[PDB]
Design an enzyme around this catalytic site. Structure first.
Site, PDB file in Angstrom:
ATOM      1  CD  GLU A 227      -0.468  24.710  31.709  1.00  0.00           C
ATOM      2  OE1 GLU A 227       0.072  24.896  31.479  1.00  0.00           O
ATOM      3  OE2 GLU A 227      -0.721  25.185  30.218  1.00  0.00           O
ATOM      4  CE  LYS A 230       3.037  26.806  29.242  1.00  0.00           C
ATOM      5  NZ  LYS A 230       2.605  25.332  29.639  1.00  0.00           N
TER       6      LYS A 230
END
Ligand SMILES: COc1cc2c(cc1OC)[C@@H](c1cccnc1)N(C(=O)c1ccc(O)cc1O)CC2
Ligand SMILES: CC(C)c1ccc(COc2ccc(CC(=O)NCCN)cc2Cl)cc1
EC number: 2.7.11.2
Length: 340
Positions: A227, A230
């Protein structure tokens, strides 16, 4: 049926937080069976009790009704085993199957709840008080869910040897950082036809030489690092579309007496302080790869860690994962149903 009676009985009990150490100590399959066939009902019932306290306008929505239906079946599924005799290797074998079915059944809670958040925004609105109640409820719901998946994974992975189900007793943190980086780079290369590079620096305070290892659930750490990558990659790339140099993403891994801290520094151009909280808001990040920031933070909290963002609008963002260095301090953080 008795589901409401069960929920009432089992919600009298408090969930029992286990430590990394206790998790690794796995006594026999029979111990896991007799522990779980009490503990899972306790944990299901506590969160089902809380779902039933949601106002009717939330409670009656198809999405909440649907996941409540999943939770009732799963509680009931486990009841069947309460009378049953462990010794009998066909009681134990049938229980493992029951866990595997339960795990399956709940795979779509997150998008199912997301749909409930979405229809609440349109039906009742996106005022800050609605935001705090969604956030309060879903943080507890999702943390409960993480804690139940952990118990079930540990039983099914062990009773089917270096790793201990989902737990790596000698987890090399930098290796999980490179894995999450390479997967995020793969997707980032596909979508953007450019990807920032990675630098890892390690700071082993006590042993400046030794690579940093720890007892952890590497899947959880991968979810969080993925996460963060990203975010840092989308930010760094889009901030520099009109530019030719792509600043790298720099991760520091620091090991102290108490904290193992993982900082991901980017030059994505950052966020005004005012907008940081919204990045953790289920409601404000519901629009219509990876688990999201709010849920990544729950994985950190799950073993007494945290995940914090600090940005410098105009420069970029630091994300820090804080984990407990010591397996003795790594204890389940469970939402418990009490007066509060
Ligand atoms: C789509 O392009 C951008 C996507 C993101 C950002 C910037 C992008 O363009 C330049 C940037 C952001 C987020 C919210 C509001 N304004 C900016 N982001 C962050 O700073 C950030 C947040 C968390 C994190 O772990 C790392 C980060 O760099 C993330 C999202
Ligand atoms: C679909 C799921 C994720 C969802 C969607 C929406 C919500 C929103 O929940 C709210 C909204 C407002 C109030 C104020 C109030 O009147 N308080 C009285 C209630 N104690 C309470 C609650 Cl529990 C929760 C969960």
């Amino acid at each position: 049926g008795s589901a409401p009676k069960y929920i009432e009985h089992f919600s009298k009990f408090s969930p029992s937080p286990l430590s990394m150490k206790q998790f690794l100590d796995f006594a026999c399959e029979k111990t896991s069976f007799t522990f779980l066939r009490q503990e899972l009902p306790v944990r299901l019932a506590n969160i089902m009790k809380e779902i039933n306290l949601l106002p009717d306008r939330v409670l009656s929505t198809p999405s909440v009704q649907l996941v409540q239906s999943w939770y009732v079946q799963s509680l009931l599924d486990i009841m069947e085993f309460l009378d049953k005799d462990p010794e009998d290797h066909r009681t134990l074998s049938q229980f493992t199957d029951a866990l595997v079915t339960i795990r399956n059944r709940h795979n779509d809670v997150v998008p199912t709840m997301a749909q409930g958040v979405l229809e609440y925004k349109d039906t009742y609105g996106d005022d800050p008080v609605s935001n705090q109640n969604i956030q309060y409820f879903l943080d507890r719901f999702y943390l409960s869910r993480i804690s139940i998946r952990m118990l079930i994974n540990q039983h099914t992975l062990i009773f089917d040897p270096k790793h201990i189900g989902s737990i790596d007793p000698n987890c090399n943190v930098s290796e999980v950082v490179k894995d999450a980086y390479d997967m995020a780079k793969l997707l980032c290369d596909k979508y953007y036809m450019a990807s920032p590079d990675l630098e890892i620096q390690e700071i082993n305070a006590a042993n400046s030489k030794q690579p940093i290892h720890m007892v952890y659930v590497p899947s959880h750490l991968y979810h969080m690092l993925f996460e963060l990558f990203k975010n840092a990659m989308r930010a760094t790339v889009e901030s520099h579309e009109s530019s030719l140099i792509l600043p790298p993403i720099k991760v520091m891994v620091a090991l102290g007496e108490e904290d193992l801290s993982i900082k991901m520094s980017d030059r994505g151009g950052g966020v005004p302080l005012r907008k940081i909280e919204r990045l953790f808001s289920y409601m404000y990040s519901t629009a219509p790869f990876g688990y999201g920031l709010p849920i990544s933070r729950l994985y950190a909290k799950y073993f007494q860690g945290d995940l914090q963002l600090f940005s410098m609008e105009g420069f970029g963002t630091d994300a820090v994962i804080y984990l407990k260095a010591l397996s003795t301090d790594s204890v389940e953080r469970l939402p418990v149903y009490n007066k509060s």
